[PDB]
Specification:
Chain A: One of its GO terms (molecular function) is protein dimerization activity. The structure is a homodimer. Chain A contains 16 helices and 9 strands. By secondary structure, chain A is α/β, with parallel strands linked by helices. The first copy, chain A, folds into 2 domains: 89 residues, Winged helix-like DNA-binding domain superfamily/Winged helix DNA-binding domain (Arc Repressor Mutant, subunit A), CATH 1.10.10.10; 228 residues, Vaccinia Virus protein VP39 (Rossmann fold). Chain A has a 7-stranded mixed beta sheet, sandwiched between helices. In chain A, strands 1-2 form a two-stranded antiparallel sheet. At the A-B interface, helix 1, helix 2, helix 4, helix 5 and helix 6 of A face helix 1, helix 2, helix 4, helix 5 and helix 6 of B.
């Protein structure tokens, strides 16, 4: 088991979190992309007091994110890809998501558990529903999805590699952020028809992004709504919903799944990719904590076991509801329409 | 080196931190004091809904603080000491300090950049107090250090120097513990410089220098140096940064904690403390490394 020191260490772990998000917000690592430098000159380039900048630097060094030799701070080469703001794996979006949204809400975790409700009203004075905030801010949603797209590379690679897309004639991805998955499918499967279904607000933007990358004729963008169930998805024998169910309460998950089931072609296949809790709902750790993040931030999001997802597939009308394990962090929940 | 995922996991470490403090604040672990229980039964006794309590329970099992089999949660015996509200080692005090003070303060870290038992035990065991006749503790919280000294050195005179508006309170606490006639309470202020400490040939200042900017530290050290008796010894117990200020990690992080929660607080190297002791007039400024988490910076008045 663990000891008192461990619990204390973890109760203070918001220290390391905010040292990192502050450094990212200050773009501190940017000042070392070209040369090494001491605290006083980093503080000059950042427009910050020398003393407090030095306190942040010493902490980042002690945490292993920076090197320091003879008073000069050095950005390690293997940290460049995620600490520099122009690198495609830059963590700045997550940092600002934490600073502006998740960190304040988790401050009120106790009350979220007491009430089984989000703390957006408490914390931000915002009495709008989760659905309201999302529908109203498609720019934030796009920024979010393009950040997530970077992380989804192992899921996408393992989906393309472990699942036979050659068996299907037409694949449609519901609510793709940026088209990364159907692009990877197109790159490996030249004969399958491909489409993304987007909200009418998000569709022109995704169309523009697909066109810029050269995929505007290869991948169609159709408009629709999983919530209202307006889903022109009947010509697609494979339908995929990427990591969306856990954003909603189970009852809403049922509505989404019934909405897709009703719109699917007869004999069609539907796959939801999710990160389930394990069999005895004992973990894994990040997913267990992700559930709490859904509690404090959304209107009824939650993580579920594989079996719980199977039950919801069946209740929504799907036949042969089953799990398909693939490489990567997601698990496929699969069912057919008969 | 570190990877993207290492940084992500640490950037989200406030997840784990709040799971623990919310669990402490909710007295969730007390519901497993005498038996195992499933989520619905813990939730009922907590006056909380079952769905949200179960989410917090699942995270605590996944973090390793609870066991779980067939839906029944178990408090591991090795965890009772710091998770149960009635146990001497209960961490609720820290959770509350984090919830009401530190966590909100650290939420604006970027704006602020831009603008104890084991010490006591190692001090009393390692340092021979018998070489002194009168010992004074400045800023003593409840007098735990002089009481420990009293319990091991019945010959030494003992006193605590407290702020005026806290002295009667401390006098009372000391009396209620049986030390009211063994430990004297004098009144004073290191910042102001009013310090009736002339009679004590060993004076101690416990973990206070880092609450202040180096400039105010110098003023404090000069104030104590002047009031001390000739021949006296002074000890400040601190947690210094290491020789190249690359750590240790908690002290580096604690330095930022002083940034957001005091006016000018900061940690320092051993050499920097020695430098300030010398600038303040002390003689034989030196480092004594005792057991426990603190280091002693020591000076004398010749």
């Amino acid at each position: 088991p663990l000891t008192k020191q461990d619990a204390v260490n973890q109760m203070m772990g918001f220290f390391q979190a905010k040292a990192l998000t502050a450094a990212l917000a200050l773009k501190l690592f940017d000042q070392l992309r070209d040369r090494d430098a001491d605290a006083a000159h980093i503080a000059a380039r950042l427009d910050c007091p020398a003393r407090s900048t030095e306190q942040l630097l010493i902490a980042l060094r002690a945490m292993g994110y920076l090197d320091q030799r003879d008073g000069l701070y050095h950005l390690p080469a293997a940290h460049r890809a995620f600490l520099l703001s122009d690198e495609p794996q830059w963590l700045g979006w997550l940092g600002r998501h934490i600073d502006t949204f998740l960190y304040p809400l988790w401050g009120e975790l106790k009350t979220a558990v007491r009430n089984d409700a989000h703390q957006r009203r408490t914390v931000f004075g915002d009495d709008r529903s989760w659905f309201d905030i999302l529908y109203q801010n498609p720019d934030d949603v796009a920024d979010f999805q393009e950040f997530l797209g970077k992380f989804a590379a192992p899921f996408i690679a393992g989906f393309v590699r472990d699942y036979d897309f050659s068996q299907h004639r037409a694949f449609l991805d519901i609510g793709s952020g940026i088209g990364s998955l159907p692009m990877a499918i197109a790159d490996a499967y030249p004969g399958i028809a491909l489409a993304i279904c987007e909200l009418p607000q998000a569709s022109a933007f995704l169309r523009d992004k697909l066109t810029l990358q050269g995929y505007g004729e290869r991948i169609d963008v159709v408009e629709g709504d999983v919530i209202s169930g307006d889903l022109p998805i009947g010509g697609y024998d494979l339908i995929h919903l990427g990591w969306m169910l856990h954003d909603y309460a189970p009852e809403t998950q049922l509505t989404i799944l019934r909405n897709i089931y009703r719109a699917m072609p007869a004999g069609g296949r539907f796959i939801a990719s999710e990160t389930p809790l394990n069999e005895d709902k004992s973990g894994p750790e990040f997913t267990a904590l992700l559930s709490l993040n859904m509690l404090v931030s959304t209107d009824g999001g939650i993580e579920s076991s594989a079996q719980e997802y199977l039950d919801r597939f069946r209740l929504a009308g799907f036949s042969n509801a089953r799990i398909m394990k693939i490489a990567g962090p997601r698990t496929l929940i699969v069912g057919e329409k008969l």
